[PDB]
Write a protein that binds this DNA or RNA. Sequence first.
RNA 1: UCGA
DNA 2: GCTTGACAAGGCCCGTCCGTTATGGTATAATGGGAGCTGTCACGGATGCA
Lengths: 611, 138, 1049, 58
Amino acid sequence: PRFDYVKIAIASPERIRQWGERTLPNGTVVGEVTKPETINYRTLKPEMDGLFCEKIFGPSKDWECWCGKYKRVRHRGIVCERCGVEVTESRVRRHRMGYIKLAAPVTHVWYLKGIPSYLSILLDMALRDVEQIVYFNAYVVLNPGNASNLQYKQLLTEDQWVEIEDQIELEGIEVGIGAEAVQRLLAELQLEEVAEKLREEILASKGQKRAKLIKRLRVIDNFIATHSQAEWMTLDVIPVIPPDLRPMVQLDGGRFATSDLNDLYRRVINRNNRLARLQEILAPEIIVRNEKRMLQEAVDALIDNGRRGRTVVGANNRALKSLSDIIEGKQGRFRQNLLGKRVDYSGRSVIVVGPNLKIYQCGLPREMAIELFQPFVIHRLIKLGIVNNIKAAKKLILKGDPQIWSVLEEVITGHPVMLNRAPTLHRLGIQAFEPILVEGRAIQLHPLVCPAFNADFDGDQMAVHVPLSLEAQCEARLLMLACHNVLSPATGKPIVAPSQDMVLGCYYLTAENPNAQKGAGRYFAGIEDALRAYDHGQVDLHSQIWIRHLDEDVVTEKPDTEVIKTEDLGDGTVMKYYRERKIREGIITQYIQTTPGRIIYNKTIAEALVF
Amino acid sequence: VQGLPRIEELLEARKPKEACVLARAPGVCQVEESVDIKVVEDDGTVSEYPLLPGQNAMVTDGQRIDVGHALTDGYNNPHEILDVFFSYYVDKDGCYQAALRGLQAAQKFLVNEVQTVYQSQGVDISDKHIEVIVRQMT
Amino acid sequence: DLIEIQHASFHWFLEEGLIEELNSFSPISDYTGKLELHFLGKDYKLKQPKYDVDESKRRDASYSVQMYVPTRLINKETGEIKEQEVFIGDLPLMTERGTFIINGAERVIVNQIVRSPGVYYKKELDKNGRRTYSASLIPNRGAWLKFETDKNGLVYVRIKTRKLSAQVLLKAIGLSDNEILDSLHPEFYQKTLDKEGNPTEEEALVELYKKLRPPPTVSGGQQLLESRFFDPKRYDLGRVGRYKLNKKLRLNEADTTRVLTPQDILAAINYLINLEFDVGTTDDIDHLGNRRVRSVGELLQNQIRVGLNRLERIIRERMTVSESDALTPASLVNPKPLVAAIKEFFGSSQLSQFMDQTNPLAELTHKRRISALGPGGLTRERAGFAVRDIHPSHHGRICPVETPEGPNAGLIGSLATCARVNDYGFIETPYFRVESGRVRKDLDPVYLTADEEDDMRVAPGDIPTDEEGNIIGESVPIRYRQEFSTTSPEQVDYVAVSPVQIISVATSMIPFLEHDDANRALMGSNMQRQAVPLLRPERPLVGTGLEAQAARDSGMVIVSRTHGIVTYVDATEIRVQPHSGEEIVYPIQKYQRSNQDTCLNQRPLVYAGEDVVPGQVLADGSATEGGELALGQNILVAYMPWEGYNYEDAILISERLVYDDVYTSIHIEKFEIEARQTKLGPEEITREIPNVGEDALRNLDEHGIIRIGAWVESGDILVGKVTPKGEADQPPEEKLLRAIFGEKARDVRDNSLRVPNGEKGRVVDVRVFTREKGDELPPGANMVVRIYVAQKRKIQVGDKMAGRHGNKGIISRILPIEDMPYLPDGRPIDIALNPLGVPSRMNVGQVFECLLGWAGENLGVRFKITPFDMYGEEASRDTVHGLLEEASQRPNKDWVFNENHPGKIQVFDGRTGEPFDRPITVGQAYMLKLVHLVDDKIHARSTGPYSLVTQQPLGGKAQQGGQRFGEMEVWALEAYGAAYILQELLTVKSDDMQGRNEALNAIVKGKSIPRPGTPESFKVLMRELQSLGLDIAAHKVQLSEDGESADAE
Amino acid sequence: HIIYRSEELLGAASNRYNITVRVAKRAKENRSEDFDSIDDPNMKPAIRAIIEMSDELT
RNA sequence: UCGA
DNA sequence: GCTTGACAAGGCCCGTCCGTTATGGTATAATGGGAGCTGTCACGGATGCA
Ligand SMILES: [Mg+2]
Ligand SMILES: [Zn+2]
């Protein structure tokens, strides 16, 4: 559908179980994962309770349940009364989420071990103080009332609590350990009343610790505006990822390719079923305390493996992939699957220099163009009446008929193709071209776009991309063509220019060779008289040649306006002699001493700028 | 020889090892183990005693002191240009005009220092591309 | 011999390395003391292998041997000796070339350089304060002793944990107050004895246990300290650790090698105190005297040590549960944890690398690589600027030129030519003795082990010497204490033995190395290891002379050993008779597949009835000519720009290189298929496969497999295999189509092995490996078929060619011989290179090479020029121009040399027939053909496979993958106005199960549709954030309605 | 002369990101109007939208 | 590991 | 343009058969665990230590 904004908040335990429990035509819901079993070893079918269960996440095959007798498309939207699997599509398994009901609360590792440890800010404790209550290392006083020397939220050691047990003061003293005491300490908080208690402590006696009460006030004020509760930071219900996001496939040798999420999910349920077993048979308290500590470490390793404790491993000695380690890294879901994707209708090849070509034109081989433009060739084959479907067209393409290459010639005319070389530093590293079918197996690139792509012909490979829609073809032509990218986006200077081999051809053309004249000092009648004398053996490339040119816009190296060697003819006509010019003043005529190489260079600009 | 690490520490706004920026704009006449410069303002009354260790050189020659004229002979701290130009103008005019003149001195320092490094390597970069990222920082 | 770090290392393991590991493991005892088990390591069997060297490569096995030791199981009370040989493990043997064969693939063991064990001191300034001196006693295996010294005279001992006072460790090991101060200046030790108390022999073990293990016990403090440095099989200094302790600290005792002596800890404190008194040397971590190398004899000693420790736990867990007697000693030793320890080192470790077998130059180089990475070396992120630079102690030991560019720039080095590693693991260089200004070149060298820094004065091999009289030069440049200086020739001590002693065996194949830049000589040495073996190689004319030694040491050249008479020579064997069972047969391999898809063909060289010598070439290899090595061809070159065809490092060749079979190589590819066991039904290889007619069943012999010698093209069927299916979920469209014309579908599915795109050739080996024939098969397989297809590839447009000086390029045009320029005798030009890349990269030696090879072309003499001269300016210019004048003195060749322009002639144009305006330098260049061909770079995809989770297109040429549109490619289109191209590349081309169907249907029908749906990768991230405990959802801001949107459903 | 016709269309328009949408929205009308059997391979609907828009510009 |  | 008896074909349904599978038990005495980290550089907070 279409949405307008995305909002993120802390998931309440009533919200996590909303995704888990689904409505089924029966007395109870079945959307809870209770067993750590995934599938069977004999057949490749899952079990009725587990991480891959069909009664929770949906049917494995399309329109087929787990037990049998419903394997047709006639039954749509009903639930089998014998098994319990809804007969629907197999694409619903990647959208349904189960839940795991715990027997003991577990603090979230992002709020405890994070920066700046928002769980310890609300409790007005230290980082090491909350880390001793959680994981069962110290006791915290929850009711110090009617006692001689006891304080609220005071840490007690193991040897210190057994001394108060002998003294029964003579009243009701309540202590706690683990996350059951942290959840009780957060549930009895006063978030409406503690906000005005910190505001009167900032103005009066601030000192250096004014920023500590300011930072604590920012966390309390966020829980009132968002209408959240402070006890929601501890987890009672654990959500389960859909099973297609933790896939279990079988290789060719018979081994299964499991994920690291299945080994971390199984450690939670195996330690949760043991905790429910110890609490039923009235186990010793040193075993129940050790079981709840491993349940705290199993969920924290599932969320962020290696955040607080040691990093758990599996069979191989590498680190297991937790829920948080698939989004933060360079190989995470953000930087490898969302910002950058692998596209279809693409290809690559090595590049060779193509001279005798134009700009906005690239050389494209025949066996690569028949794969990139494959849906465009098939459409032209049915339109011309050669084939009737795709199976008759695909057999005609792979056969190698000469009529297929005549269809491919008529398709690529006017279809822009974006060329791309990695790495893409600036925006002119992706330009569009009009391809032509050439002979060979490499991309005939233009030598003028070589400083733009920063491409050298010693092993460079360039990626080829083909647009599909009609709006993408008009954007590649009007905005991304190579002819419209003369100027750089950084400065105002052009980059489409002669660089290496054409500068040496123009430097030698307009040079001055003082030995090979062969007819220097001759007068010619205009520009076209000297071009007709170069096709003959009359003049060389560097001969001193006087050219009758009546224009005044003549630029040269070290220009001058002074007149030296003034010579006067008869009838008042004066000759104005210069260093390179010879003007007959009263302007009648004007002769320019130059080389025929500079006339061929000046003729090339005339036929290119005047059309 | 320090082209690329200089542009990195300028955009990160890191604090250098040494910094000495005058807090006002007085008329300082230098009357000379370490050299000491006494700050006496003829327009004002209160003086200033700045810290100057022996490992720093001199830049001022006498009667030449701006509002944020530094004496470092090295790298300047861009965070110290803010609070000098802000606290000196928070009492004269309003706080919004003191923040506009404070951010303008920090903006002109960052653009002129990035262009200094890029021109030393023979690299042409237009000024309008640099000041867009400086606008996002200030 | 050039391979001595591999042959002498594995020979030491088979006689000293394996004996020492079994002697330290034996004997073992039980918990009570009933019986004892001790081995006899010095009497092992090492029986015969199972398969051949060539048979193990095609059968997918390993050239290994079985290891058996005699084992005596004795009992304490009852006198009984049970002698029985028990199987230990599978050990892969080293072949005759110095390599191993693991799972049918040839592998090498790269020598890894690490730090030597010993004591190292370092002056460290943690902040702007006083000068602090540290220490580090590194063992071969065990815990470290790091002694530090803070301000005000406080020396501390740190044993990872918090530091502690020096008197705590020095008194807990057992010492008195008078045995410390007599061998120590003791005035500096009074400052650290004041604020430390004064503990007794028993008043220090309690306080040591309270800080290391935070109740203290009088027996717990002794068992903790003894297990770290004094217990056997937990702390080892090594044979080289005892040698470095007696050299640095100048100790009198020796040959301990097992236990850390407590007198050595007192000497390390005494050297640390004296560093504040301005006496003593600070060690360097990058010095080669402090850096060791290890090889196969040492790396295998650590794998059996961690493999026998796992066997010790099972041998002690079986002599306690079984309380009864009369048990065999062959059941006490379980070979399973030790077999898996050797198989992990040779196949799953990082240091066992895939062998490069392109040419014999890359095979010789890969066995001599010195890499600083591995399990115990360095890290790719922990490598800095100081470890990648060249140390002054690398002169003659490690090659300063040959190193790979890119990520591993400086971490993977190469051994030099004359370098040698001793038994201690240090690199040595030979030197000639100089006595009173006279090089004593009469006796053996000295082989100094990097001890010439602070003691000796070493001159290189470039000084002009006389014939046994004296040295010609008066100012000899030397190196003394890592600094260069010029002293008198009577004051020097040693001189180098060769000018190629600094460079490696691959850099020495570059003629005129002194005229080329060091950056292009780095590229010229790497491109020489990538040259393919041609069909008919040719020896270079400007060779350096070292190609003959590298060909014999590669192992692919058959040499004589008997000094006999050759009797019979054919294309398969050579039969000679030895003289002063007398008929030996030398086998010759014909077109064997290599690791890099090249050939390993050998050709016979000798004839019948010829005297041979030990060390004579009998049959050369694929990339080896007669005697010397040959990696390329000598053809004409011209440095002239064509019409844009050699614009930016591009190559213009002629058509003469195509039809003369120049640069034509043979590539043999190998295909694989397997008839596995599907649980629905067993798969078998048949010929009658469905939906395939007679267009592909022409080369099958009624068995489903192709024959030998059949020309296969792209799209054929090599092995026809069927697979049973049990779906039975036919759509209603296919049920109506089948009911009309009949032809009910079978239960099988065609899974035949087919030829990939752009692949062709001739089938040469159709070897089938099935069961009940004498070979082992993997589980879940009935028949294994292996197909080898050979093809003959010519030189085409797009291939990457290079020379010996780093002038790489890609051919863009192949012109006919009438369009190429021609010499004034009528001979055309093969290559028209670009002269613009020469002066910008300082490639001057390639101009000296072509101008000298052109002199050797008209004379036919095949010059051998050694690098690094002779008289200055009289040995390179007047050698080339002097020998070009001798070729012009012939009466038929007067156009070769000109007086005005010496290294130039007049070249005529081939198209118009007119001469060019300026003379062009011509010559005979030696170009190579690299492995980066145009066939391996072609890839295209319309629609293929997809990913498992994100439903995105895959990546890879061998699996029909798509090109990645990364983050830098989005920023270019975002800087453009291409918003519709960016939405198309992210939605209808990747990660949309619905949008890809409608976009493909729109092109075939002819009416495109806008508005693609939500991509799949965003919905995966939405479900992953909800599993992290975050209530994240998408809403709508419409009028009086704030409802959550269902992106998934 | 197609590249000379595109530079005249991008000029005198004051927004180069807006006149390229009118070309893409006119090429879809030329494709739906060319649904008959006559199909010119040289004149694509994307190219015909640029020539027809430049003739009405003048 | 190797190419740009 | 429709209709009826006849002849097999085959899917569920309901019994038992035996391989498969979950569960509980065995009585000399046995009583705190191994395996690496020790050569990266810079910046920003957070303790903690006077
Ligand atoms: Mg390049
Ligand atoms: Zn069912």
